[PDB]
């Protein structure tokens, strides 16, 4: 019974473990 429950629990913990950008604004250079 512990063998089977343990394989279930290990598969269960197998699934357990398995489970900034800059701004926008008007252009920096404009015509002089």
């Amino acid at each position: 019974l512990l063998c089977v429950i343990a394989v279930v629990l290990v598969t269960l913990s197998y699934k357990a473990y398995k489970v900034q950008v800059i701004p926008g604004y008007t252009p920096r250079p404009i015509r002089p």
């Binding site: 701004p23 604004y25 250079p29 404009i30 002089p32």
Partner: protein, 152 residues
């Protein structure tokens, strides 16, 4: 143990006779480049400094910056191609958790100021035009530079 033989002396304080300013005798790089490019101006190079400043600024900060070039009092109209601003940083000292103090000067060709910078990093950008300017992701989230009063 209490003797140690080893003893420690004190950093001397330097007092500027003209400003009364007392000086004790990677982030600092970004803070320097940010302030210099943000505060400086030259009709001939500003497009890069302008875009760089925005690249190193949070949208809130970018907007504050962009606005300096707007209206009749725009840097683009006031300085235009008649006058220019030269900026140099003397010293930067971090003071906490995303915050640093920048001591710098500025002059007009044709003053002493201190900036307080709140900042973070947003990691590497994903555009060639951004990574070749700010690969680290430096970003200013808050910015306020105050000049001295009267002479300074």
């Amino acid at each position: 143990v209490g003797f140690s033989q080893p003893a420690p002396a004190p950093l001397v304080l330097r007092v500027d006779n003209a400003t009364g300013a007392v000086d004790v005798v990677v982030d600092t790089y970004w803070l320097n480049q940010y302030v210099l490019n943000r505060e400086a101006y030259d009709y001939n190079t500003i497009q890069m400094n302008y875009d760089t400043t925005a690249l190193l600024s949070a949208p809130a900060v970018q907007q504050d910056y962009y606005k300096l070039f707007d209206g009749s009092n725009a840097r683009d109209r006031v300085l235009g191609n008649k006058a220019r601003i030269t900026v140099r940083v003397r010293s930067i000292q971090p003071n906490g958790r995303g915050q640093a103090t920048v001591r710098f000067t500025t002059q007009q060709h044709n003053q002493h100021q201190i900036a307080t910078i709140g900042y973070t990093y947003i990691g590497a950008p994903m555009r060639s035009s951004d990574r070749l300017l700010n690969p680290l992701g430096f970003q200013v989230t808050s910015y306020r530079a105050d000049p001295e009063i009267l002479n300074n």
